Curated annotation (Swiss-Prot), chain A:
Phenotype upon changing residue 51 to L: In MRD48; uncertain significance
Regulation: Regulated by guanine nucleotide exchange factors (GEFs) which promote the exchange of bound GDP for free GTP, GTPase activating proteins (GAPs) which increase the GTP hydrolysis activity, and GDP dissociation inhibitors which inhibit the dissociation of the nucleotide from the GTPase. GTP hydrolysis is stimulated by ARHGAP30.
Reported function: Plasma membrane-associated small GTPase which cycles between active GTP-bound and inactive GDP-bound states. In its active state, binds to a variety of effector proteins to regulate cellular responses such as secretory processes, phagocytosis of apoptotic cells, epithelial cell polarization, neurons adhesion, migration and differentiation, and growth-factor induced formation of membrane ruffles. Rac1 p21/rho GDI heterodimer is the active component of the cytosolic factor sigma 1, which is involved in stimulation of the NADPH oxidase activity in macrophages.
Annotated GTP binding sites: 12-18, 31-32, 34-35, 59-60, 116, 118-119, 158-160
Database matches in PROSITE patterns: RHO (PS51420)
Effect of residue 30 to V: No interaction with PPP5C. Translocates to the plasma membrane; also
Protein name, as recorded: Ras-related C3 botulinum toxin substrate 1
Chemical reaction(s) catalysed: GTP + H2O = GDP + phosphate + H(+)
PTM annotation (Phosphoserine): residues: 71
From Swiss-Prot, chain B:
Effect of residue 172 to T: In MRD44; no effect on RAC1-mediated signaling; no effect on neurite outgrowth
Tissue: Widely expressed, with highest levels in heart, skeletal muscle, and brain.
The family this protein is said to belong to: Belongs to the protein kinase superfamily. CAMK Ser/Thr protein kinase family.
Function of the molecule: Guanine nucleotide exchange factor (GEF) for RHOA and RAC1 GTPases. Involved in coordinating actin remodeling, which is necessary for cell migration and growth. Plays a key role in the regulation of neurite outgrowth and lamellipodia formation. In developing hippocampal neurons, limits dendrite formation, without affecting the establishment of axon polarity. Once dendrites are formed, involved in the control of synaptic function by regulating the endocytosis of AMPA-selective glutamate receptors (AMPARs) at CA1 excitatory synapses. May act as a regulator of adipogenesis.
Residues of the full protein shown: 1290 to 1594 of 3097
Clinical condition linked: Intellectual developmental disorder, autosomal dominant 44, with microcephaly: A disorder characterized by developmental delay, variable intellectual disability, distinctive facial features, and abnormalities of the fingers. Most patients also have microcephaly.
Phenotype for residue 145 to A: 40% decrease in nucleotide exchange activity
Domain free text: The N-terminal DBL/GEF domain specifically catalyzes nucleotide exchange for RAC1, leading to the activation of Jun kinase and the production of membrane ruffles. The second DBL/GEF domain is an exchange factor for rhoa and induces the formation of stress fibers.
Impact upon substituting residue 138 to A: 80% decrease in nucleotide exchange activity
Top-level taxon of the source organism: Eukaryota
Domain DH: 3-178
Occurrences of domain PH (ranges): 188-276
Free-text description of this protein's post-translational modifications in UniProt: Phosphorylated on serine residue(s).
Protein's name according to its UniProt entry: Triple functional domain protein
Species annotation: Homo sapiens (Human)
Length: 177, 279
């Protein structure tokens, strides 16, 4: 049974830690969402094939460009994440995350993940962006970004509702197998 | 206040888990190298100091001093910032750890083969050696997030939280700055205050160093030293003509361009700090 190392990267606003906790844990949204997700390892089944899935968070490292790559060696697949309700985080995919990942890991598959899908139709969120002359990131725009950066797959999800969450990690595994 | 209890519990429990993690790593992977029965690859034999860096120094600090200090503030979350301030000096050991990390990794992937993976299997360990070895890097980067969360559920004029936060943003900044400094080629003396690329700069207490990012003939990416200036010439300009920030008897010859407005603000403040210091 092969081992898979998956590293989650993206801006601080993206909810990387929430995504990981929601995926790995039962009854996710508790009274308190933890700041720390320790390196996780478990056997997962994808298409009737067992794999040992390793997950590493990078939360807290967003401002330290020489510390981040310390986590990159031997990575089998990256999740590059942006929030569907943060155009800033989306722009940093092409401007920050893709260049960095590709520099250190020329041949490692990338899954592009749009997080906070539950907020995309939230009136208050849309209005807050509108005040900054901004709009939530649409599916076509996300798809376009994925093709632009050569991601193996583009996927949208919500840590909160867990919609699309399982598929993110299934597809990360399939990108390696 | 309930929020405060959750944050403090997380800080303490993750500190305990971190200490346990370091102890596990040293009990297993390290012990096998120094005292184990199985053959050790020739390329890693007697090189445990490269592989594990100063992990033992880090463990001793947290186990003997820092965890005990945190547990003392267990029900005084407003005042836990003081702990980080008091022990600021000790966290410098993380600069050492981070600087050594690339060497550890290289030695593992090139010379260890499956030696550590076999130990992992034998000990029934969930964490690989690489998983343990990244933990200090993750930890030194998590403190500031926990202190930020505390800061938000406290009010202005009561804490020392902010002072603790300042320290814990400074430590990974200094580790990161040091990694950049090691890439400088073609170039004591003074403390490194800022580094960033402009149109790569290293601002020390009494020197200002200009570099250019290039690649070696070996393909290794580094900063080629180009020029240097001493503490004198300052030029304060923030605006251009609908563009990012550009700054410098004086002439127009001196041009420096920062990416964002916030980054521009830093350098101005920090250069001026060591202009009055040298005079």
């Amino acid at each position: 049974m092969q081992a898979i190392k998956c590293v989650v990267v993206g801006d601080g606003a993206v909810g990387k830690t929430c995504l990981l906790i929601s995926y790995t844990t039962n009854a996710f949204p508790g009274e308190y969402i933890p700041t720390v997700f320790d390196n996780y390892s478990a056997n997962v089944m994808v298409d009737g094939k067992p794999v040992n899935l390793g997950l590493w968070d990078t939360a807290g490292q967003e401002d330290y460009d020489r510390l981040r790559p310390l986590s990159y060696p031997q990575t089998d697949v990256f999740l590059i994440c942006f929030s569907l309700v943060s155009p800033a985080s989306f722009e940093n995919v092409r401007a920050k995350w893709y260049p960095e990942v590709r520099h250190h890991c020329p041949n490692t598959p990338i899954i592009l993940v749009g997080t906070k899908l539950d907020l995309r139709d939230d009136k208050d969120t849309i209005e807050k962006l509108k005040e900054k002359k901004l709009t939530p990131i649409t599916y076509p725009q996300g798809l376009a970004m994925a093709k632009e950066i050569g991601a193996v797959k583009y996927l949208e999800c919500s840590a909160l509702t867990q919609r699309g969450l399982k598929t993110v990690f299934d597809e990360a595994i399939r990108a390696v197998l | 206040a309930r929020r405060k209890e959750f944050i403090m519990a997380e800080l303490i429990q993750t500190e305990k888990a971190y200490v346990r993690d370091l102890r596990e790593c040293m009990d297993t992977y390290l012990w096998e190298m120094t005292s184990g029965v199985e053959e050790i690859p020739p390329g890693i034999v007697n090189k445990e100091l490269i592989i594990f860096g100063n992990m033992q120094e880090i463990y001793e600090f947290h186990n003997n001093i820092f965890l005990k200090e945190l547990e003392k503030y267990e029900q005084l979350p407003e005042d836990v910032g003081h702990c980080f301030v008091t022990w600021a000096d000790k966290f410098q050991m993380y600069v050492t750890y981070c600087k050594n990390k690339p060497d550890s990794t290289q030695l593992i992937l090139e010379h260890a083969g499956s030696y550590f993976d076999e130990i992992q299997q034998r000990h029934g360990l969930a964490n690989s050696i690489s998983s343990y070895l990244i933990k200090p890097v993750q930890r030194i980067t998590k403190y500031q997030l926990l202190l930020k969360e505390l800061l938000t559920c406290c009010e202005e004029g009561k804490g020392e939280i902010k002072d603790g936060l300042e320290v814990m943003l400074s430590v990974p900044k200094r580790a990161n700055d040091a990694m950049h400094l090691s890439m400088l080629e073609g170039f004591s003396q003074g403390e490194l205050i800022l580094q960033e690329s402009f149109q790569h700069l290293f601002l020390f207490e009494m020197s200002l160093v200009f570099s250019k990012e290039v690649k070696d003939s070996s393909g290794r990416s580094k900063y080629l030293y180009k020029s240097k200036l001493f503490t004198s010439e300052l030029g304060v300009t923030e605006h251009v003509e609908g563009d990012p920030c550009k700054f410098a008897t004086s002439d127009n010859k001196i041009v420096l361009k920062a990416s964002s407005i916030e980054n521009k603000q830093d350098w101005i403040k920090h250069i001026r700090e060591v202009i009055q210091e040298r005079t």
